[PDB]
From a paper:
Influenza A virus has two surface glycoproteins, hemagglutinin (HA) and neuraminidase (NA), that act as the major antigens. NA is a type II transmembrane protein that forms a homotetramer. Neuraminidase (NA) of human influenza H3N2 virus has evolved rapidly and been accumulating mutations for more than half-century.
To further examine the structural mechanism of epistasis between K385N and N387K, we determined the crystal structure of NAs from Bil69, SD93, and Mos99 to 1.54 Å, 1.65 Å, and 1.40 Å, respectively. Flow cytometry analysis showed that N387K decreased the cell surface expression of Mos99 NA, while the addition of K385N restored it. Our results showed that N387K reduced the Tm of Mos99 NA and SD93 NA by around 5 °C. The destabilizing effect of N387K could be partially compensated by K385N. Consequently, the positively charged mutation N387K would result in an unfavorable electrostatic interaction with Lys385 and Lys389, which explains the destabilizing effect of N387K in Mos99 NA. Nevertheless, K385N removes a positively charged side chain, which enables Lys387 to adapt a different backbone conformation and point away from Lys389 to minimize unfavorable electrostatic interaction. Therefore, our structural analysis explains why K385N is a permissive mutation for N387K and exemplifies how specific epistasis in the natural evolution of human H3N2 NA modulates its structural conformation.
Author numbering:
A (entry chain A), B (entry chain A), C (entry chain A), D (entry chain A): 82 to 469
């Protein structure tokens, strides 16, 4: 095995094609299936895996009551091959209420954060063993991407935040070689608040599109140089903005440099990626709620401030159905690197009160250079058929 | 690993011997087992796998109600080693309400169709990654074989249809190398309607026996040249015809060129293969319903129009028990290529109303050059012991 | 990989030590576990597997009612690593109501008999594919060992019977190379009725100890030459006889040549093996019922007619608990070939009427050259805690 | 593969970071999960496995009643990858009510003790086969570590005891090469009673920290030379003592040579390891009960009699929650050998009478040279939501 360098060009993208769906909530009504949230996908050089943060319980289980909360000592990172729902044979890779994972071409890295909110521990596990750890630097919920990290030539990078979710916080970018932290760089640039970054290789470095939970409904961008550890940051130029909540399409804006101060408080994890001067992006269809999911290309939406010229829209989840977090992962083909994304389909409390639990399923799409049609691929469980 | 060429001769066939059975409906009454339909079998160079289209639910689950329908956004292609019933650890390989899979000697190809009836997407997944996609060309339920595709020297071929199920439709043959579509040829020849082809390697090309849903109770044949992409087609010569519904044995006929216009509307997926001038074929024992299953050789039934001289009959499922789709797969031996087949054993609605679900189990037989006896290997579940 | 030749000497044996137990009936009261009977063990060069004939159902399942019967079209051969109980992820290797399996050093052979009692089919599956088949030669329940076959230099041998279970029958020894039957020899010698042979490599050939269901409570021996296909047979010399039913120890006898005509009708599968002039053997502790299980060495019990001088007794299952079939398997060590055995622990009907099903668990011991103590390792389920 | 020698230095330790948690009791309320006790962890050169002694039953099962007892013929050693809870697909490696396992770099050794209390058998299984056995030498519950053994250059060592749990007993150290016992040495030195040793490689030999069940609340140390088979022993010097029960911190003492005679009767399995003149150790937070779990370093606590100067305390399980046995395992990194530990989190009877069963989950931490925060990671099941 050799280290990945991701040195091939990005594949041509005309949109996205269906790749995977796990139906886990429908299965949970007739099977012992983990309660999860914050899923993601990452692939080793041969095959893809799904990940999520368990809640230390199956769904048809009294312990699924009041699983809406994000952080408990029972959450662990689950990992199975993609399309295998999280069943009782699934491996719990580490103790985690926040995580990121990625394969460097030779082995898996996992970054797993657990413990007290004011004094958490992040463990760094590589090739099946603990190699490093850090404690919280700001004593305010050390936390990370909830999607794949990215490794180039054996140096893996991951973005972490510690501090307020509604004010200035302290974000840092770690550089990790065979599980050992070799450098830590502070965030720099124009991004004012960065959470839950969705990162991808853009040789020779790494590019991330994140969540501003404070003043922006436009998404931050963080670029990472893995050779000299420098960082720059700004916001996606597109005037069709990617966060939820957000204003309507006519009222929304971005001009690349600053948070837009438009319904900027709160947010949802999401993604975007550049294609020349254009941007491909996903977002919820609702502007207020995590309902529906659409993708499209904004023409000149990477380079031109406030462009709203979209094309190539696809509905992934219709507006009548629940969505959730979403994130990017990248897959090496014969001659190019493709971009794919997952959508978390959240079910249960607080929004659906017929049940006491909160969980999710996933759906997953990959870039295509071919053609495609239309559809909608929601979670599909009937809340009234579920165990309470 | 090397590409398969399937260049060995067909094995000698004196009939068929038992190979596998999964008992999945009996197990579903005391276990969490997927609801399926449209199963098939395909082998990599070492071992065989069973496949089927899940319904996004287990059987003992409220979501198994009204699983008679063919297309939903929750159907996914399931894949396990042959003889492992579809349990909660089974991988959902792709999103699909129509599919075909095959191994080229180096990796698996999956062709997976999902989305809206009038604007579906087919994804082409090879070696664990999405490589290509197409949209519907006729806006009328793009669909494929529901059994294994066939690859020679790294070029895999698969037959797809789009258009009416009871009128002229548009069938195309795709040629796919490492997941990338390199050519598409239209159907040509005397076959007038082609669905759900059962294809096999017949070096140097591929031969298929299919379902005419419009005017024939005789089965179409499609031959595919993988070098120059040419296509020819006609109908199985045997006057003992392979579709259901069909007329009785004295009234039925075929003369090789045209659909017989004998109870030709509707049909069932099935198979046949040539053995010199003779044909080996399966069919339901009932002429009207998907009940029982028999195989036999028709002497000169490949070459002589309307031959009805059978020999070497075997009952696979007695006339009192349900059958379903059936299809061929091929397995390389030391010196010859063998032909095998599966039978889908459908249980539940609409025919059996004691339950609300529709599902299936499988039984599987392989060609033999040896000897054998008699038996009957039906699904075996007692409908009155099942969850509703 | 190379073919096994089993050319090392037999290990020194001072008795037997515990090796495995699956607890499957206790687990069946809180888990979805197959209903089985006729288990056995066989090892590839690295690790051991347990096998059994399923009944097409789990235990907590309405289909477990009236699973006392030996032959149905739903029975399949199950195979898992040894110590993994038969759960819903277990592979059903073939359709079988009688079977034998063995690994030749390169791949697995399975011999699987199914179909009608008067016209069964045996399939021969090697390296994952069907290679050969035969039909019944006497039209009276073609059947085989229910324990491992044995392969030397790529030639595997298996003993099969067809004909009366209470009169002269037709036994044959098949010689199978990479799944293909290359020769069939009739039984020859002084054994008058041979069923369910427990065979082991005794380089340069194979030795079997079997069940006489007609006139002997002493067990037949069949010796097989794999080079020239010749066969000889007789009966274990020990006057402590191995079958059940049998007379008491003072009344029982054997003089090596003939069935003893002592409670000879009926029987149970079992085993013995030679150690110089001595014999190591197992048997039920009860003389009438399949209750308890003991092993011991009879001094000069291989060579001296009617020797009853035992030593080195061990209780494996106390007399108060149920046993069942038992059989031998052999395991290659660094410098010697060891002998091991399993015991089927049968629970349920007809003897235990609190439940409607019949099933079993297993316990497994291996020869030792070391020391050991005493114990009893019965099934352990409480019949009153079981699903009906 | 090569034999492990463990010749690298011990890693620098600043404390411990979270590594794994299985949540098995919470899962048992909605899933078929084994009833266990006496767990441990051991790693092959690539990945870690969890082990425990099953009780021959799942938890939601009538057979889980009265599983408080330590020894039955149904207990077997379970083994899965670390973080996979013990589910129905888990392999039962051997019959055992006491065990130890370890990987020599090429294959696994298991030491498995079962049978009658007064005449037990220990089986020695290596690379999947039984290689050796011994019987009890003192006829009083032959027993072993309940945590990993240690192998250097192909010689594995394991500590065993036979005799009184409250008086002088006979402890022996066995040296085992590819499963064969090559030497047995008696305990020698100042340790007066030794049970349940937690051993680790300390090149060129092995060091163990154990449980004195008779007169010490300070833990014994046993050092083993694997070249010449010599043994020495004494007690951990730290005046902060590691057993439970124990006196309070001001009253407790140790002076390295003798059991302290301070609440010395009874005990719990636990661990400690040297770091220069300092000692890292775990213990329950309660002095009387198996409640809470803490680690810390005692400065000069390896070399200076009765040192009580602690630093670097961490709570692993808060004082309000149950703990249990604990033990060490060692993991090879790129340049150093790390020390890790597990804690058994016992639930059920006798202490918790709402249920009839006794079982456990695990939590696992590894040494770090980095930084970390605070937390508490208890079992987390609600006893009132459990099956009885
Ligand atoms: C079968 O499946 C296929 C594949 O999924 C579907 O095709 C997709 O259809 C969607 C929806 O129409 C297309 O996305 C939309 O693209 C619009 C921009 O393209 C049009 O305008 C440009 C500029 O004039 C033209 O160049 C284009 O022409 C070319 O493409 C068409 C096919 O679309 C060919 O027919 C032509 O020959 C040309 O080659 C197009 O005419 C874009 O405006 C649109 O976004 C608006 O609409 C969506 C709802 O659809 C809103 O959510 C969104 O907010 C936008 O609305 C704002 O903007 C409009 C316009 O200014 C205002 O009117 C609104 O008020 C609001 O301000 C969306 O992105 C997609 O490109 C196309 N894919 C491909 C590969 O062709 C088939 O439709 C489907 N068939 C069925 C029956 O299911
Ligand atoms: C144990 O298992 C074995 C293996 O499964 C069974 O053997 C199989 O038996 C079936 C059923 O008999 C055989 O298939 C049938 O083959 C018929 C053609 O062969 C006969 O005719 C030709 C031409 O005269 C002869 O050459 C043959 O002779 C040779 O073979 C036999 C053994 O069969 C030997 O004994 C001889 O020495 C020769 O070597 C045969 O005599 C074929 O007609 C038949 O199909 C009709 O019948 C089936 C029902 O069985 C109908 O479904 C079907 O529609 C056909 O009926 C139409 O045609 C007939 C005849 O014209 C009309 O009368 C009807 O009205 C209707 O128009 C079927 O294909 C099979 O070949 C054979 N397998 C082998 C390898 O031998 C054993 O029977 C079984 N024993 C038991 C007790 O279970
Ligand atoms: C801890 O575990 C160990 C290991 O499992 C147990 O040791 C085993 O114990 C059994 C039962 O005693 C032994 O098997 C029996 O062997 C009897 C033959 O050996 C004795 O006689 C010969 C000939 O005189 C002597 O050479 C032997 O002496 C040597 O061995 C002993 C140890 O046993 C040493 O102490 C000596 O120093 C010598 O080295 C023995 O004295 C054999 O007769 C016996 O079979 C009869 O009894 C069983 C019930 O146990 C019946 O089921 C069976 O039918 C036989 O009974 C018939 O025969 C007798 C005698 O003629 C008649 O009296 C009866 O009426 C009837 O006709 C059995 O095979 C086994 O060898 C031994 N294993 C080893 C390795 O030592 C320990 O006992 C156990 N301790 C506890 C407390 O649990
Ligand atoms: C976020 O997480 C981190 C990491 O887990 C937490 O930091 C850990 O905190 C614990 C608890 O304080 C530390 O362990 C304790 O260490 C005590 C010894 O160190 C102090 O004394 C020595 C000698 O004077 C000084 O050198 C030290 O100074 C250095 O370290 C501190 C940080 O701790 C820096 O701030 C300094 O600049 C220096 O670099 C320390 O001052 C040790 O006494 C203590 O053990 C007593 O207390 C525990 C309860 O905490 C009792 O269970 C135990 O029995 C001991 O109590 C006996 O002894 C004391 C003192 O004699 C008596 O008063 C008692 O009555 C009784 O006799 C414990 O081992 C740990 O070292 C530290 N880890 C690291 C890496 O820093 C943060 O606190 C946490 N923050 C939050 C808010 O959650
Ligand atoms: C769902 O989980 C809730 C949060 O844990 C449980 O509420 C707790 O209940 C106890 C008892 O009233 C309180 O002491 C504690 O303050 C907390 O609110 C709740 O009981 C549990 N069950 C249901 C059905 O809601
Ligand atoms: C089985 O599934 C049916 C098809 O989904 C359910 O019918 C639906 O029921 C709702 C309520 O009456 C309708 O609004 C909808 O039109 C559709 O017919 C059916 O309820 C469900 N259950 C049963 C027991 O049949
Ligand atoms: C257990 O299985 C029996 C054997 O299949 C069932 O008996 C059958 O029952 C039907 C109905 O009376 C008969 O027509 C048939 O002859 C056969 O005896 C039996 O019902 C089933 N259940 C129980 C509880 O015994
Ligand atoms: C839990 O398991 C106990 C120990 O096995 C059972 O007690 C046994 O019960 C039988 C019947 O009274 C006695 O003969 C035997 O002496 C022993 O005490 C107990 O019944 C079982 N169930 C419960 C609910 O405790
Ligand atoms: Ca925001
Ligand atoms: Ca038709
Ligand atoms: Ca007999
Ligand atoms: Ca003590």
């Amino acid at each position: 095995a050799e280290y990945r360098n991701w040195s091939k060009p990005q594949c041509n993208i005309t949109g996205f094609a269906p790749f995977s769906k796990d139906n886990s909530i429908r299965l949970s009504a007739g099977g012992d299936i983990w309660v999860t949230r914050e899923p993601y996908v990452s692939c080793d050089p041969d095959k893809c895996y799904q990940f999520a943060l368990g809640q230390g319980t199956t769904l048809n289980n009294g312990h699924s009551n009041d699983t809406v909360h994000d952080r408990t000592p029972y959450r662990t990172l689950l990992m199975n091959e993609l399309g295998v729902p999280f069943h009782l044979g699934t491996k719990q890779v580490c103790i985690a209420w926040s995580s990121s994972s990625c394969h460097d071409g030779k082995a898996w890295l996992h970054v797993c954060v657990t413990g007290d909110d004011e004094n958490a521990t992040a463990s760094f596990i590589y090739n099946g063993r603990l190699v490093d750890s850090i404690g919280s630097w700001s004593k305010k919920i050390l936390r990370t991407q909830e999607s794949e990290c990215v490794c180039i030539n054996g140096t893996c990078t991951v973005v972490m935040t510690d501090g307020s979710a509604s004010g200035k916080a302290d974000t840092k970018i770690l550089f990790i070689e065979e599980g050992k932290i070799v450098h830590t760089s502070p965030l720099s640039g124009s991004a004012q608040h960065v959470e839950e970054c969705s990162c991808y290789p853009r040789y020779p470095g790494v590019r991330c599109v994140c969540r501003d939970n404070w003043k922006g409904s436009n998404r931050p961008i963080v670029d990472i140089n893995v050779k000299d550890y420098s960082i720059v940051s700004s916001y996606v130029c597109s005037g069709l903005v990617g966060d939820t909540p957000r204003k309507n399409d006519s009222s929304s804006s971005s001009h690349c440099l600053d948070p837009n101060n438009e319904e900027g408080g709160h947010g949802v994890k999401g993604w975007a990626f550049d294609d020349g001067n254009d941007v491909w992006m996903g977002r919820t269809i609702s502007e207020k709620l995590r309902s529906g999911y659409e993708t499209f290309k904004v023409i000149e939406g990477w380079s031109k401030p406030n462009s709203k010229l979209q094309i190539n829209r696809q509905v992934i989840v219709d507006r009548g159905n629940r969505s959730g977090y979403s994130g990017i992962f990248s897959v090496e083909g014969k001659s190019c690197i493709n971009r794919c994304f997952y959508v978390e389909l959240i079910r249960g409390r607080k929004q659906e009160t017929e049940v006491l639990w909160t969980s999710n399923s996933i759906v997953v799409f990959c870039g295509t250079s071919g053609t495609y049609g239309t559809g909608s691929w929601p979670d599909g469980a009937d809340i009234n058929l579920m165990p309470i």
